[PDB]
Amino acid sequence: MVTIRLARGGSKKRPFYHLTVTNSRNARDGRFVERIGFFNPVATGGEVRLSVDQERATYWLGQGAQPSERVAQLLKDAAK
């Protein structure tokens, strides 16, 4: 299964997530086929909280990728 999940790529007590397209068997922060966007839960000023790159998100979704419970909520929030 190819999946769209969040790769924890920030720092201690300051999480940052990469919206990542990858096979479900790979590790969270490990191998992937493509990164498509990112999510900042602690964005304060000019930091963009969520960038999605809506184009490639549909392509992998059309290929059968199954987003996780967090990305699916974030995907709706991006389009809402």
Partner RNA sequence: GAACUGAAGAGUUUGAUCAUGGCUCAGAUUGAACGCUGGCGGCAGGCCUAACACAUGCAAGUCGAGCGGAUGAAGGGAGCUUGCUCCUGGAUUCAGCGGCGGACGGGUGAGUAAUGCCUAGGAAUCUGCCUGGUAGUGGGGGAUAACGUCCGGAAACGGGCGCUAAUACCGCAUACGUCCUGAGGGAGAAAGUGGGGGAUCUUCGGACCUCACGCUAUCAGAUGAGCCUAGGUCGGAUUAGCUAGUUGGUGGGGUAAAGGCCUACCAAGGCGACGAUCCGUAACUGGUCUGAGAGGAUGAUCAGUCACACUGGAACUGAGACACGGUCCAGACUCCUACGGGAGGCAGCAGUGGGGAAUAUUGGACAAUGGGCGAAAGCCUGAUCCAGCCAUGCCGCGUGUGUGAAGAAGGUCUUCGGAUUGUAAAGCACUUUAAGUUGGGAGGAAGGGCAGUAAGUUAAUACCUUGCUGUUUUGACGUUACCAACAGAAUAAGCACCGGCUAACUUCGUGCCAGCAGCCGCGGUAAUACGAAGGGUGCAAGCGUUAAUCGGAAUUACUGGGCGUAAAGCGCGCGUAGGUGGUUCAGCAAGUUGGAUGUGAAAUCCCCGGGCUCAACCUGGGAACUGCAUCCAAAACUACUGAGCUA
Partner RNA sequence: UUACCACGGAGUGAUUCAUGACUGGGGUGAAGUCGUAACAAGGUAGCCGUAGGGGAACCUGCGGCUGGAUC
Q: Do 70 and 18 meet the contact criterion of CB atoms below 8 Å apart? A: no
Give dist(CA 79, CA 71) in Å, integer.
12
79 binding RNA? (CB under 7 A): no
- Within 42-71, the residues that bind RNA by CB under 7 A are 42-47, 51, 62-66, 68-71
Backbone angles phi, psi at 4, to 5 degrees: -110, 115
Least separation in angstroms between residue 78's CB and RNA is: 13
Residues that bind RNA (CB under 7 A): 1-3, 5-18, 23-31, 33, 35, 38, 41-47, 51, 62-66, 68-71, 73, 76, 80
